[PDB]
Amino acid sequence: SLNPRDVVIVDFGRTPMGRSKGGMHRNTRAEDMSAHLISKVLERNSKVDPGEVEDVIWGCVNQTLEQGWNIARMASLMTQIPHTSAAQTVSRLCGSSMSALHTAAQAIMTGNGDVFVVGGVEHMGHVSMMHGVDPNPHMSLYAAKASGMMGLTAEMLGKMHGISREQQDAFAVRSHQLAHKATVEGKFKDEIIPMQGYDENGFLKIFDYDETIRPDTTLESLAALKPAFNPKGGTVTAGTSSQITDGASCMIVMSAQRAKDLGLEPLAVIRSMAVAGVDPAIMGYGPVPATQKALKRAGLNMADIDFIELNEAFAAQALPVLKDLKVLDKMNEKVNLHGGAIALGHPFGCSGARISGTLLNVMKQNGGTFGLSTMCIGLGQGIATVFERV
């Protein structure tokens, strides 16, 4: 049974990923990319009324230029969502989108809204991550400036838990492999929303796949790569790290009570939400603290969750997490079965709900029940969520 106050996820949608460098989104604004996605996901669910949408909580990080001035509203205005609805842009770096899901879910449980539209976007191609960055000198008085560089925070964990190059590249090939496999075997069809884009020559066509996925990825092809952050002694390379990708992700969320009224079959039900912090120098260890506080608030154990979706930031950060989660030996059985961020890219603002949505599909596609959506966050942070299939 489901209490009227519980949270329900109606549908999930995500734009086809694409290389930020001369990719399919080279000429698409992050605003239009979001508004377009939101509008499309609302069409597949003609039962829910755009007017009932209390608030649109979008996820974004580098909020400036295209992504500035509350992009959550700048996008909701170019959709069927009335001007009567609200819109806020939540930012928590990588876990931005996921935090948005929580803000809405919690907004529902407290009787402050019945229907919400959550998601996130991040067009790194236009609004690059290195644009407009003014380091704070005083930050060095309380922490290490180096802790700011995500690449180095991955190196430290790769040395603390002993993760070799032969292991990191092995996890990378797995991501590309499984990602391509799921793609070809049609598994992303229910979530990928056909979107117009441009190819090399500049021709207009619709993409429904993921450019970021490189099938020709092998242990040998990655071994030929050189350390991208630490010259002498580095283990993490551009091949083991996630990719700079333009893309969004939407998700219709509402109360269970309203679900029993609109007669629409759910996709999952949120059970526990959690966020935690760790040392900035080793932010890659954020998932574990978040997962624990999540399972506890759900009265469960790591053994109760059938499928797990861990955002693949770096190969030197994912493995350590899965190892201390006592599920490493269960990787190929319940962890990123359709692919990871290493092959699907990591849009700072979209990744949040992106992996959470994909998780729901992995469960529905394999008769799973409990799912785990966790990810590490820059400057020492972590966030997790547990969805139940019922």
Next chain:
Amino acid sequence: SLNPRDVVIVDFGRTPMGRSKGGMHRNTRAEDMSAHLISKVLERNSKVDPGEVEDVIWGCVNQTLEQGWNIARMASLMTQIPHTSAAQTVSRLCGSSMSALHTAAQAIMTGNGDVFVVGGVEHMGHVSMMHGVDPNPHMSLYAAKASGMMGLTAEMLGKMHGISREQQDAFAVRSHQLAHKATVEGKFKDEIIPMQGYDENGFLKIFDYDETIRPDTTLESLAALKPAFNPKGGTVTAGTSSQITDGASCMIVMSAQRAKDLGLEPLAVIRSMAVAGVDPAIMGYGPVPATQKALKRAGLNMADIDFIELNEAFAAQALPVLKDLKVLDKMNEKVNLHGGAIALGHPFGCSGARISGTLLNVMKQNGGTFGLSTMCIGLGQGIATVFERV
């Protein structure tokens, strides 16, 4: 009585406002300004342990440079708040900080945390509002580009409800007057946190007052001013509009049950939270839709609220709201008695909880019970909150 699930506001704090142009904060980073405030507010409440702080939800709008990359965490790291705590930066333009309060409050009601530290900051001096703004052409296909200019959206309402110049300037003097009065008579003493700054010559000294307040403001001095947005036919000037000010605002919030455990006397208790949307062209009419949805969610009427705090965006937007709220003839009795945004400035990211915090003091200072903190938001939005003194 108070149920353990209700929300409690322990203490409120705010930095001394200051002109963005060659002001007291000309040499203070928005990051350090926040971290310094948060740290100080936690000292006055030595009973609450910084470690128990589940999450720090800060408010910010133009998140770039200094205010970019999740400033909420970038500030929480330079305080007594452990790395174990989380931090997110919520953006909803003007109502950013206020939305932060809701996210935390709702996070408490749902058992997703016991102690939170909310607030917001906006150093318009360094990160000006016109910095890095890339207008979206497609927006004109669904709305009016002019609606983006906050000044013009004020003109429209000034014509729709018939607000003359002689009225707008009258409301402006009132703000400066009451603000200066409350200041001199020591009414902001409990909220203003002494902060180091610099004067004209460049000397280092501590400010405890508000520079933005110009006591020499009269109906004559304002009448000598010329329209700032619409030349022939304009009514709104820089004198009737809010000020470009650097400043932050902090607020310690936790559950009621935890309050009965730490034995600390509350300041107010959140009863209802609400957000709504209006037409971008007339975003100044956002407060009314928000207040209504708030009072109803609290089972109250506009007559039950003893004191009201309406962020004075423009004189041409505040009056219309108070008129349609049926409390215009009750202004001098329960509306911005200590001053408004026209004399205290309007930091896009701080104004949210700033006016709400001031509201709590106005209630405690005059034996009030129910308070109303509402404000209009750009691109057609509104947000309100109702606090109870008990």
Next chain:
Amino acid sequence: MIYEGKAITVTALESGIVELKFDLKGESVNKFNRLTLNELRQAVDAIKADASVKGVIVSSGKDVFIVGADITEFVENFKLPDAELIAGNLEANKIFSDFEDLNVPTVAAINGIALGGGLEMCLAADFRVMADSAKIGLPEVKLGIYPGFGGTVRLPRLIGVDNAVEWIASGKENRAEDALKVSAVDAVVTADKLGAAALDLIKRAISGELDYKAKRQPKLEKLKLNAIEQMMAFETAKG
């Protein structure tokens, strides 16, 4: 007066505040030679006894503030046995440390160039006011060495590990603007107004407006950084 040497003069002022000016008569600039080190020693022991003192303002009579000691004496000093050398600095740092532990607010008025030991002198004080037309730095590495007068001790704890590592490993000069941003200086003002800038600051420290005891503490205790944060803070710096 309270004290008077050939390179240092300690003149009394209003409200008990006393000024300690570095003016090496005869020469063009100021530097920590054998004489200055001894005179500063006596100056400190003098202020350490005078009970009418309510504050100390360190100024400069020459154009530049204080530059490195004579390169000639460096070589002469780098020939002595390690044991005798360390004793020379062990007793040297004691002088500055004494001016640091002085139970009274101290501020340095950097009117001009303050290099090597000059900056280290200011680092010993509590507050620091600098002229917009001045420059400060630690060009010790330009000789194959690093700050020997508490430089590698007070700077890292005052402006942060990272920023300190940079200021030291490069030995570059720093403009007024940058000096303030890293908090190596507390305030920048025009040359002419630099005078009252120090006086006004002192009074705002004596009264209690500016807790000087709390501002001096940081460089008398362990770094604020985490153990984990340190591992990265240094290793990355080294690499």
